[PDB]
């Protein structure tokens, strides 16, 4: 079970952990999220399911974006299954719900209300995008990285706790 | 470096801010229509508590 403050922070390290069943798209999103030379260390983490095999030395994880591939109902059954292994103090600010495949709206095995209901019943931001195309990735990557500096505390005015008060 | 140590001070005065907020929330031990209302009256009252703080 992941907790927000189980590890100590670094200096400029903002460790986000992507969550999605498909992993090539997660790798593409991670590549785009490090393409821009931002002012923060960006030890991006990938995964498939929140059990997250127990390996110590994992840094203080500052964001978990649940990439829910709307094209595949698996990406929700593997998110909702993985949503039960997140600490309740982790769901406040440091949780986003990416919904890739939205907008195509013809491959969607999942009605975007269902991801809306999931991201509202867990009280966390829900950021639509279409991760397959770099044009909508290289702008969602700069949205996840500015949410990153909010949850990791790099912007010295806004906490992760202040964040969800903005994205309600 | 000093700018980098300044980015650290700042980042840590907010990471300890988060740490103290969480440990105070852990120190403590309903009307959903108003549960967001006594959620809103801080997000306005912490807001006046820290916009004046940032303004000082």
């Amino acid at each position: 079970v992941l907790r927000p403050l189980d590890k100590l922070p670094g200096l400029n390290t903002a460790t986000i952990l992507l969550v999605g069943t498909e992993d090539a798209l997660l790798q593409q999103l991670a590549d785009s999220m490090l393409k821009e030379d931002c002012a923060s260390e960006l030890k991006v983490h990938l995964a498939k399911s929140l059990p997250l095999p127990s390996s110590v030395n994992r840094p203080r994880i500052d964001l978990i974006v649940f990439v829910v591939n709307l094209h595949s109902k698996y990406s929700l059954q593997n998110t909702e299954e993985s949503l039960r292994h997140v600490d309740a103090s982790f769901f406040l600010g440091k949780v986003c719900f990416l919904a890739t495949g939205a907008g195509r709206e013809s491959h969607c095995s999942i009605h975007r209300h269902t991801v809306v209901k999931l991201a509202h019943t867990y009280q966390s931001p829900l950021l639509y995008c279409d991760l397959e195309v770099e044009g909508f990735r290289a702008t969602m990557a700069q949205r996840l990285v500015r949410v990153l500096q909010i949850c990791a505390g790099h912007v010295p005015g806004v906490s992760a706790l202040n964040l969800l008060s903005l994205l309600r | 470096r000093m700018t980098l140590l300044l980015r650290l001070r700042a980042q840590t005065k907010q990471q300890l801010l988060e740490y103290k907020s969480m440990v105070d929330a852990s120190e403590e031990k309903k009307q959903i229509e108003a549960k967001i209302e006594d959620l809103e009256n801080e997000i306005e009252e912490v807001k006046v508590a820290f916009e004046i703080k940032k303004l000082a």
């Binding site: 670094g10 200096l11 | 980098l4 650290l8």
Partner: peptide, 13 residues
């Protein structure tokens, strides 16, 4: 203090 970079950069290795 601060394993961070003030150690890691100085002990660059």
């Amino acid at each position: 203090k601060s394993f961070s970079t003030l150690f890691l950069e100085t002990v660059k290795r």
